[PDB]
Amino acid sequence: HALIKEDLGQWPVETGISLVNQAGVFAVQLANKLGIDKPFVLDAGSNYFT
Amino acid sequence: MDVLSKGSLKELLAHLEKTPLEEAISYRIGTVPYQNVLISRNEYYNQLYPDTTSLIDGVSREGQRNVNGLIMSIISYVVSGSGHYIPNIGFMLLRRSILDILTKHDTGLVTNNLNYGIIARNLTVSKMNCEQRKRMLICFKLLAYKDGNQNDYEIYLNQNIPLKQIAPNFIPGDMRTVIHNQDQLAIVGIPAYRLTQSTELSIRDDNAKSYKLGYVDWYNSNSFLRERSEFNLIRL
Amino acid sequence: YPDADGNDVSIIFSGAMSHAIFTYAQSQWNKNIIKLDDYIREITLTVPKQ
Amino acid sequence: ANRATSAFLDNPHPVGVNYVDEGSRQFVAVAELLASKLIDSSRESDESNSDVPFVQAYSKFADDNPRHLRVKTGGKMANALTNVIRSYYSINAPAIVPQVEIDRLASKATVSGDMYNSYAIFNSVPIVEVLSPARTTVSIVGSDRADVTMLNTGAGAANITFNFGQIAETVILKGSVPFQLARLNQPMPAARFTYKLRPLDGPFIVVLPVGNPLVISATAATRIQVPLAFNKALVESGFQTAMNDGLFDIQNVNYYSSFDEFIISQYHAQDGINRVSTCVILGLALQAYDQMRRALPVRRV
Amino acid sequence: ANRATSAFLDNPHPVGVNYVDEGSRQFVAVAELLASKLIDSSRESDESNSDVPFVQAYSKFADDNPRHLRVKTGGKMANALTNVIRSYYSINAPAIVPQVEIDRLASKATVSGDMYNSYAIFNSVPIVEVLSPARTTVSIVGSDRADVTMLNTGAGAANITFNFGQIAETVILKGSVPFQLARLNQPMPAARFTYKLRPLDGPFIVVLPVGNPLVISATAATRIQVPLAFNKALVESGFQTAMNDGLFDIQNVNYYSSFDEFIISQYHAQDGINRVSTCVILGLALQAYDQMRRALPV
Amino acid sequence: NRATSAFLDNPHPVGVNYVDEGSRQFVAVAELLASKLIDSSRESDESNSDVPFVQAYSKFADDNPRHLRVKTGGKMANALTNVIRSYYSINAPAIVPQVEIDRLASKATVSGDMYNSYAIFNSVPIVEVLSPARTTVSIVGSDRADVTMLNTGAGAANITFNFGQIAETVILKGSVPFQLARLNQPMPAARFTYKLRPLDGPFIVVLPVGNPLVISATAATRIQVPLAFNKALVESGFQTAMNDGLFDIQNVNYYSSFDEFIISQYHAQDGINRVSTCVILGLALQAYDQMRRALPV
Amino acid sequence: KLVGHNYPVYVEPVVNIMNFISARFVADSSYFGYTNEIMIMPNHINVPVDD
């Protein structure tokens, strides 16, 4: 057996607190980890082997 | 844009040498000229604004396939920046430059038996300004001298005194007359300060203003876009 | 492989959410990236006529 | 013997053959997008008690800022859009806008310009031909719902032939009293109130007895390829504004009550498939004309 | 001589002369804006699983928090909007709402009550009078599409005079069979299916041949200045709701099928210009009434 | 003599499947995702990138869009199409499994029901118009009723109008002023327009001998609908579904619009329970129109 | 002011990005490690599972 898994981390959620507030706080952290918060341009054309 | 920007006889003649006849003519059917129409000018009036469509409006119009239609298309391109719709000219004439059509015998086109009075009436010479009148007479003189009709050119100028005053001072066969000529023939050009982005009443005036306003942007952003298409291609 | 307009397109095996977030971020920054000539045109409209 | 036809289907005038290339289509799509921004910016300016949102949208639209002591009409973009709308309606309307202006205006936005992304449903009912016997009187009234009133005097069981054309997809027939209807060389079914018909099935024969006038109400549905930005409410409102302003006051043209009748009448003429393509571009242009004209109101009673 | 008129044009009742000042106009615009957010809050409530977007919008609208115990009515804004609508329809309706309450409600949002910054197209067909000779019978039916049926029973052809008023901008005439219409003192044109007319030019003469009946379908377009937030679809829905809810139930008034008929009927009064301004404000209020009552039905 | 509206005659039974709480959640979820799919497409067309459309299609169809393959809409489109078929007629098969519907309904959460709002339906019901001897009555139209009446007898005739008991208000207008009043009530003076409540009872209208009288009728009916209901979209969805042949099933009745469909089912025995299914069909047609416009096939 | 703020037409890309991430956090919860429903069953009951 084999499988492919996407790992974006674990983000616990509290039931009492509003989900939108937690989503927004987690959105800031996720953007920072992914490196998309600041203006950027992808440079991956040189990432290859012949 | 490029043809209307030339401000000297040398530059105009040099441009016509490098420009094929394909640029003079157009592939859009347009509308029939000499039509009394009502156009919309909401800048000024609520009612529709009358005007008459002409061959020098700057918009492609239908033209016949005879010799006169081809000559009228060339003159319209020089004075208005856009030509007419002549169906199926043929690849043989499209590759030739405008000057060879005007001043050479190898094009296979019989430009004799041409009436300058009839052509001037069709092009609405009474409506064109000094620069457009000057450019039209340059084409007439080149056609006359190639076919040996210098007398008919002089007769036409004698009948039209206003055109005789502003006649060009060059002789087609002599290079010295071309270099020393001091005529100004620039319809469009980069202006000091700027011009307001406002419409004009006439079809000719509004279309001419659209060329002047867009010349500045065309001047800055044409080299790269033309080069991308020019690269990996053979000229006509 | 090259795109029609000279861009480089990378085909890789990646996650559904990581691809969705990263490419959406790219499209948001890209609409604010314009040519110099277009930038000059916008500036010229703000400054006086002369 | 007697023949009847819908009023809006008679003599469809030719449409313009200009401004139909890819560059002109991009110009129309750009105009619709920027005219929409004008409407939203006007709403934002009203709420924010400031002219900042409107100035930015107008500057992008007109390449000029709004001017004091000078009515704001839209500048060169408004002039180009108004003239191409006139050219789309009839061949007799002139071609005034040069190609250089359109290419300059088409570069303002990044629209696709595709005219076949989606579809729209049009409700005009085409009754091409209704053939009646000598002693029968037939009247056709309406475009959105056609009421056909038929009276038979003397003899009995007059046969009326209905020809709905071939373009319409589905046609629904409702009668004041149950009636008999069947296709050619087919048995007549029991009388019933309503019928669902495919106009391509063929001519339809309806049996009309003596006395007791029978009225048939017909509604049709037709599908035409339109862009995704197409909105029928804006197109119809733009159509009325164009008629009121006089943009369609051209010689030797036909006038219609709505854009629905316009597009259907052009579709049912000869070479109507290529006429519809021009009509759809006119619809998008009228959509832009409506939003632009509501943002800037020149006319004052 | 037989004179036939449109049914909806007769006896327009006086409209209210209250709540037309700048402060009151801002109140109606505020109500439209806040009712729009109330509807949108339902969709924003579905993207999440909470009711906070709806509770947040209701508190802004009603100045009170929603409670599960009672039916959500709308608070003080609902009562003000309902009563102001009644005062618009008839001059006999009382002006119950104080101006202090309206001023307080107008400060919730920062909208400006400019009701002359746009236009709308109204499709009601005004037929003031159709004059016919003795032998002919003329019947006018409908408002959005006027179907005029005329039958001639005399020996010779008849001339029928059409008066479409002096307000409509354009009128399009389509006949079952081709017919001839010319303006007074102008030569008759050939028979055509479709005629386009400008009502201001003058009365029109129609030639009625002896034989089968002739039916003319008329469509009109009128431009009336309206606020930019005007939505004709939303206004029409609110008119039906207000009629059903009994907001228009008051003695000595006239009832209309649609807001299209109402505004055109008022415009065609003796002094109809001043009525149109009040009618437009009623439409904007009706637009807010439709949005609010759909979110909060009672 | 008796005259009745054409669209009110013999309403066919509606489907009895896919009406539970889980099925209703599936329709509400489908409408929510279809609306996002059409909004992303418009945003996609305006901009250079097609990222918003790819994400919306993936959520709707559970597979990424591909240039070579056509955009069918996925399993959600197939389930929605067959569910629409089942609602219209009881003879249409109910084949879509419930486990598949439950899985699709879990894509999104909807905070609402099918009874939290209302919509006004302007279809005029004329149940019957009873006419005496030598009185010709014709009823034309559904959105606007044109009752043309003409009598040839020497004396004036009384005509009975029955508008049912479901409509809230009915507005009457005539070519010439006419007198109308309830049963056993004095006749008023002639007026051009009347406003009536259909619950008031049968109405008597007099007819003079001279000229034909035409009465134009409009009506308003309120039906409980979800807050996401949109009459403009359900009308477009009804026409599209009819053209697609989703309603081509034997022994059923065809209507000109969804307005006539819901009103005719209301004016029938067991009409309260039929209307609930019709409202669910309306939201499903709303989702169908939005999806088909973004993904024409 | 926070509650009644209206997003400008030229909203910054960082706001659009964060709204996209927050929407995906709520819409697709299985990616981030939470769900809305769970099921508790005894061992002797056989439940159809993803195999």
Side-chain angles (χ1 to χ4, degrees), chain E residues 13 26 73 121 144 148 161 198 225 231 265 272:
Chain E
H13 63 279
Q26 288 197 9
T73 61
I121 290 278
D144 55 348
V148 182
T161 293
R198 184 176 80 108
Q225 306 214 249
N231 205 317
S265 180

Side-chain angles (χ1 to χ4, degrees), chain F:
Chain F
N1 289 337
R2 194 171 151 300
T4 187
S5 296
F7 77 101
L8 278 181
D9 187 54
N10 215 28
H12 67 260
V14 303
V16 305
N17 295 286
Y18 304 123
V19 287
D20 44 55
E21 265 84 22
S23 305
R24 294 197 245 100
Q25 215 194 359
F26 155 72
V27 166
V29 157
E31 190 253 355
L32 171 81
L33 296 193
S35 97
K36 282 149 129 143
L37 174 77
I38 205 159
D39 263 321
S40 53
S41 298
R42 304 210 180 101
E43 165 160 2
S44 178
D45 184 1
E46 299 151 6
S47 181
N48 263 346
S49 88
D50 289 345
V51 186
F53 176 75
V54 167
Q55 163 292 313
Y57 191 91
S58 323
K59 187 96 183 126
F60 197 78
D62 309 359
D63 50 349
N64 271 243
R66 316 261 288 278
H67 298 279
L68 211 59
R69 280 207 220 98
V70 84
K71 281 170 290 321
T72 66
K75 293 179 179 179
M76 180 87 88
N78 197 58
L80 193 68
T81 300
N82 293 325
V83 160
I84 284 167
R85 261 211 197 78
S86 178
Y87 285 143
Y88 198 64
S89 153
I90 205 154
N91 317 122
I95 277 304
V96 160
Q98 194 75 229
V99 56
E100 182 215 25
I101 282 191
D102 295 341
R103 185 192 69 80
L104 294 168
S106 178
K107 285 193 183 14
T109 38
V110 282
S111 184
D113 263 324
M114 306 262 135
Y115 312 98
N116 58 346
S117 194
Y118 73 81
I120 299 284
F121 290 99
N122 64 34
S123 200
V124 55
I126 309 189
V127 184
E128 51 195 319
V129 160
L130 306 163
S131 64
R134 293 182 183 174
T135 314
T136 55
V137 177
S138 178
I139 306 182
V140 197
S142 174
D143 61 356
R144 200 190 61 213
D146 289 345
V147 197
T148 293
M149 293 183 284
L150 151 73
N151 73 322
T152 86
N158 294 346
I159 294 113
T160 279
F161 273 56
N162 184 35
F163 290 112
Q165 305 194 61
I166 311 301
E168 267 174 319
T169 86
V170 172
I171 284 280
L172 289 189
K173 283 201 268 282
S175 40
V176 283
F178 62 99
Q179 341 188 34
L180 165 143
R182 305 167 63 209
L183 267 150
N184 304 346
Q185 288 257 299
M187 282 275 129
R191 322 200 300 258
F192 274 97
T193 185
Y194 293 63
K195 188 184 121 137
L196 326 169
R197 198 160 45 110
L199 286 202
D200 281 343
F203 300 101
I204 289 303
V205 54
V206 314
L207 231 48
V209 202
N211 236 28
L213 175 71
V214 179
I215 285 189
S216 318
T218 62
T221 312
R222 160 179 325 173
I223 307 197
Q224 291 210 267
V225 297
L227 187 34
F229 210 84
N230 199 233
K231 259 195 90 169
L233 295 166
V234 72
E235 284 332 289
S236 186
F238 197 84
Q239 295 291 20
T240 279
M242 202 154 257
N243 295 5
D244 288 339
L246 306 190
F247 297 158
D248 295 16
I249 178 64
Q250 62 201 311
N251 307 107
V252 316
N253 199 345
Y254 300 105
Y255 307 101
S256 180
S257 85
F258 185 80
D259 289 345
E260 318 185 2
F261 173 72
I262 203 163
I263 292 312
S264 93
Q265 297 270 333
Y266 212 111
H267 285 74
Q269 293 177 335
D270 221 33
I272 296 276
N273 318 108
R274 289 162 166 231
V275 155
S276 80
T277 305
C278 299
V279 165
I280 306 170
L281 183 54
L283 206 69
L285 287 172
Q286 198 192 318
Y288 189 74
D289 181 65
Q290 271 148 348
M291 164 198 57
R292 263 311 165 258
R293 289 211 309 257
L295 319 164
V297 86

Side-chain angles (χ1 to χ4, degrees), chain E residues 16-25 88 99 277-279 281:
Chain E
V17 293
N18 256 305
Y19 314 115
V20 286
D21 39 320
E22 209 203 335
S24 296
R25 289 190 321 247
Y88 281 146
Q99 303 283 0
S277 300
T278 307
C279 295
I281 313 192

